[PDB]
Amino acid sequence: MHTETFSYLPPLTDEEIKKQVEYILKNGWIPGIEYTDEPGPHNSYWSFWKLPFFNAETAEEVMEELEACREANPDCYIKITGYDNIRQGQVLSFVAYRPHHH
Amino acid sequence: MHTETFSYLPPLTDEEIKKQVEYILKNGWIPGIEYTDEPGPHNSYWSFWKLPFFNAETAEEVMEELEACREANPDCYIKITGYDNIRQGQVLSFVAYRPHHH
Amino acid sequence: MHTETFSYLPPLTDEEIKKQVEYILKNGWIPGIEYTDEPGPHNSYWSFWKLPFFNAETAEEVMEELEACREANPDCYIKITGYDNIRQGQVLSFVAYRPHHH
Amino acid sequence: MHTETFSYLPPLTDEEIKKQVEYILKNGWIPGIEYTDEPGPHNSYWSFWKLPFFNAETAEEVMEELEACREANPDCYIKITGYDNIRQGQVLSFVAYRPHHH
Amino acid sequence: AAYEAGVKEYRQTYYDPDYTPKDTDILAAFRITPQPGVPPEEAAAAVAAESSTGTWTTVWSDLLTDLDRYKARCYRIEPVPGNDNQYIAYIAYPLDLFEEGSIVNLMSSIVGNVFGFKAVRALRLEDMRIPVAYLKTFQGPPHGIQVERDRLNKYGRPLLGCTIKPKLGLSAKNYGRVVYECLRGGLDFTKDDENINSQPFMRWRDRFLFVMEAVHKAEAETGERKGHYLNVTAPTMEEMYKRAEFAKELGSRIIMVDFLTAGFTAFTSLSKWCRENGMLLHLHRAMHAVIDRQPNHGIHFRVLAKWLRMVGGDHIHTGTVVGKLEGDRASTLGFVDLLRENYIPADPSRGIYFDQDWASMPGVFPVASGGIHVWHMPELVTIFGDDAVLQFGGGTLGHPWGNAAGATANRVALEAVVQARNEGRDILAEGREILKEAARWSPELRAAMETWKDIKFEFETVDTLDV
Amino acid sequence: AAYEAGVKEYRQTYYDPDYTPKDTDILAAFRITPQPGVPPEEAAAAVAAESSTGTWTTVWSDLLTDLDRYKARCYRIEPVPGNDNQYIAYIAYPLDLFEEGSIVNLMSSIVGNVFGFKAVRALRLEDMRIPVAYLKTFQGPPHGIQVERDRLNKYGRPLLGCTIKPKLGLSAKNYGRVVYECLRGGLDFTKDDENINSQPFMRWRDRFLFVMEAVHKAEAETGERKGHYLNVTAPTMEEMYKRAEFAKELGSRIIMVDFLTAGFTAFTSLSKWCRENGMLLHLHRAMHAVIDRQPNHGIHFRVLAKWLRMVGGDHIHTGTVVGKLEGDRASTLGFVDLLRENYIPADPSRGIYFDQDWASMPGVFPVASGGIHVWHMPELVTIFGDDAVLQFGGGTLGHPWGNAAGATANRVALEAVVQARNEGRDILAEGREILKEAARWSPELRAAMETWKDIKFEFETVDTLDV
Amino acid sequence: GNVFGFKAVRALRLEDMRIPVAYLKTFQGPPHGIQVERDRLNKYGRPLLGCTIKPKLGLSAKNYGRVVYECLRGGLDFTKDDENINSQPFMRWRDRFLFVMEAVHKAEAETGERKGHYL
Ligand SMILES: O=C(O)[C@@](O)(COP(=O)(O)O)[C@H](O)[C@H](O)COP(=O)(O)O
Ligand SMILES: O=C(O)[C@@](O)(COP(=O)(O)O)[C@H](O)[C@H](O)COP(=O)(O)O
Ligand SMILES: [Mg+2]
Ligand SMILES: [Mg+2]
Ligand SMILES: [Mg+2]
């Protein structure tokens, strides 16, 4: 089960994940977190963890929510998203955490 | 060239025509006069001589208009009509005068 | 698995269920009991417990039937229905008992 | 055979025709002359007498052309036209001369 | 003289105060404001004449037919309470003036030209008596309330919907996301905004695809049947059919149309299509207030309500009374009955001028929508009862925690109110306490109540009944 | 808090008095009457918001899109001369809010819900600026004035028509008779009444058959091209197409539709069909005065005129000014220009709020109809000029000698007036003398003039411009 | 549907029915009806005259056309197929329609009166 962008790289470390979040914020885009236990090609709509973080100012805020999502959903795939309302679409979506049964 | 009702009888005399007009008036129907030089099966609308005689009270009034129509259109077929606005349709239509070239 | 009306409230107590039965009877409607092990959105026809209780006069009668249905079908969902033959349709349907595996 | 504009008026005198030509020129429109022996409703294209008189400066010029057309085509209907290239369409068309067999 | 040419007064032929209407006559009640100097019965006779058989001068061709049998007749004129310049004119139209099954034809007579006459300063069609013999020429609702509840397997409460917001500007995939969140949180329905058709920011086929993925996902996740009213309002009938067919292809149970902006010819075609294809039809009344807002001129909504029930829809917007758009309580209760019941007696206190029989034509779900939120739930359930759709657009997507939470808040509020009603509580007197009870165990409802506490819409009503 | 939930004032987001409209924006001018206590710019901002992107409370989903680029903006609010409670609000809408080629969509936004808000006591859409970039998404008239004149081979005078009477109750064969008499006497056109569709007293196929026999007979007898506007107004699109197709099969050059009662979806389909089938399309505006009569609420006809030219017709009724139906002279001259010209500058004295460019879209024939007779001919030719259809229903069939005489009287009156105008005479000052000149040699005109001498329609105008 | 066959009822005749206007309005009624038909035929003031072709069965298409021509040209308004003339080995229906309509149009042109054969 590949999960699109960065799925062909080794799993990202927390510091590598944070650098992707910093890229989202640096470009003025909105970071978000999504998760699911049904990751296949049929599923356009992973579960939102809260809402996209319109008010997030730092990458650390987002990493803290990622850890919370993982703690609450350790059996799920968890992705980081970046969103641009001007083009109106996601500019980046990648899996940050895979469950043990991957 | 047959002309529908009474066309298979000998031409009607003026007195026979007048009796048909009296039948129209007796039944509360409206007498009228139509004429044409194009009498065939393609023609639903012979020329009106004036309008249907909504105000006619006697058969003689109608016979006088018939003579006037003939005098003015001696080359035409001329029919007497009777009209009922309740059923909304003609109750009688027959040729009273045929031109010499018949 | 949500079960339509009252599914977003806490599970009803027997006392709260009986008040709904009284509401059905008070309005001249016919109480009934239905049950199934297949409660999803594909199933329009849960099993009838007996027939709609056309002759029921008291809510206690219905609660007794409800307990009997539960004892006989403890692994099933059980709903109370209220039925109006004048409009010809159910006026109320809600789940009174959910099985342990819910 | 009615011939569209002014056909329900008495035939125009030469003086009345010239006033219409003056109306055409006064408004900056182009006078023309058309003629035919086939005036019915099937015929969109009467014969041109020469070309539309793009260079005409006086109504008398046009009346002279009208007389010349009539002399050459006494058995034809002859119309005066007024033409506007800005709207791209004729602004006036009327029969000035009808043949003896009319 | 063959006949009497020239101008007569309309009242000589078209005012008959001793006429007794037949049970097959179409009746109209017009609020008429004559010009000064025009007798009220002449103005009323002008309306009767120029909506049936007459024009402005005598024509001989009247004598070709039986004018007595075809003319409309003003059979009653009455003053208006509190206005010495307005009258109610009652006009009777023979049944065979009207094309069978054609509201388009009915309108072309009843409201075709008569609102523009110089002799009439203002004209409002207040009510019509549609006889059973004419009703039987119409399909009526594609399904109607009882069939719809059976098709949805939903009994015992109002249904809950929600217009997606912002009105315009969302992409197709974002539309699907917000729909999924709304439906999965407990709403029965979501919908396109009335002005969401097909646009550069979101083309309709893209929208239908992503929305129906969301609908089916929410239905499987919750276990309750869901629907999104996909809007088939379109420039041409051909486009409208294409959009209806794709909704069906994707498995939608329901579509919507803006029946007035699309118009009654396309509406009648679509209603027949919905019957033939088993599709629920939600009617949005966009543009109605252009016509029905002012008490002195236009057409009251209760007339439009009869016409649209005849052509047929399964839902129709009827107002909220308490929300952001105007809806006079008494009149609204009146035309809700006109839309749902089989027999409605005349009732001056609710603006019902005529007894109306529906000869078993199914009822239409009223839809209460526009500027309502959780605190309105007790009164909404009181006003409309179980057979209504209550829609919360801003009242769902404006929840501080997002759509799923907003949907849960509205669903919890509704069920708590319905439960309390069924238990015998006075939900109007206890409405706030009932909501607070449920907020003790529903944090979603608690937050919704905090968000909109003391938000109310209370204004002087423009379209009121006569005093 | 993820975002700022709760209710804001609309003017915080939707009132921008420093916005400069783009040449691609759709502009609207609304006459708005706020409730007391509602700031005028808040009422105007509510209209802008609820006809574009906004609702009654803040929604997080705004942040998914670029609201700044999609929102409508009220960019100007001005007081109304002589009314301290009305304002003109100017609102600008981005081009990509609108479905291409869809007046239905445009209406669903601009006039969809905003006329019913409690905060707004009354609302009238007075004008719209339709940008060229949106106009190019529409077909426009199937043919338009120049093509129609070329297709009819008629140049240099107004065209003449006539509504058959009595409105309802005639049989098919009688309809053909009266049509034959009218056309053979000199009228270019006759027409079904707007409410003649298909009825028990006369079914449409029977009518079309007998009428077209009459049309072809009159055309052959007179030598001039004739037409009868066969009415295809129908309950369903399927019936409408059937009737249009049979008109074509029988060789009619022209049909009519009641474009408002049928509605804009069916109208748009029919206009496309008329283009594809070479059929002239006469538009009857039945129901318009329900919407456009009152100066305080509704939609002014000049807006409807733009919309119908965009969708496309070849003729449209525009009023008479002097006849039985109301038509303010100044406003009428204004929207006649809006219907015929390629560029119309703003003109407050004629109610034209915006410059309007038509980017070569053909013009539509205005049709003056309703309560006019021969004595009106001088002024009608003066008001409208050559490019108009003047229709005399009662003014033909009410001639004391019948239809052919009535038709000849109107044709003679018209040609005498046109001749006199072209000769340089002042036809307004000399109008009565011109008619009397022609009556000396036309007994038909003489009798028509005797019949309607001193019949006039002069009333105080309800829908007037501001003073 | 079933009530004429019950054991408990020896005989049953439906004599009349009152059809209410509200049910009648759900029906088309005659395609044209008497008034419209008279206008379509341009015939007023007398009953119309028709005629069933005979022998009932056994005539060929061309012979059918001949007898129709002779009937109509002599003053009848109508002729008709017998009720049991449909399509058969002795005369197939398209052949019949072809020859009959040649005869109808010929008789109409010859007499000047509108004719019809009920095919
Ligand atoms: O566009 C709107 O305003 C709505 O989507 C409501 O939005 P909210 O739920 O966010 O208010 C509805 O279309 C209106 O209720 C229609 O008015 P009516 O029902 O009176 O026809
Ligand atoms: O029904 C009628 O009254 C007419 O047939 C006119 O009859 P007359 O010619 O006998 O008056 C036209 O439809 C109106 O002019 C329409 O009004 P408008 O043109 O203002 O839309
Ligand atoms: Mg909406
Ligand atoms: Mg009319
Ligand atoms: Mg037989």
GROMACS .gro file of C-alpha atoms and ligand atoms in nm, chain E residues 163 165 167 191 193-194 284, chain F residues 113, ligand 3:
model
    9
  571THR     CA    1  -2.721   2.454   0.240
  573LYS     CA    2  -2.165   2.773   0.220
  575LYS     CA    3  -2.285   3.025  -0.158
  599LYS     CA    4  -2.788   2.081  -0.075
  601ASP     CA    5  -2.718   2.660  -0.302
  602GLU     CA    6  -2.992   2.775  -0.538
  692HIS     CA    7  -3.641   2.590  -0.430
  988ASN     CA    8  -3.355   3.533  -0.223
 1464MG      MG    9  -2.972   2.907  -0.078
   0.00000   0.00000   0.00000
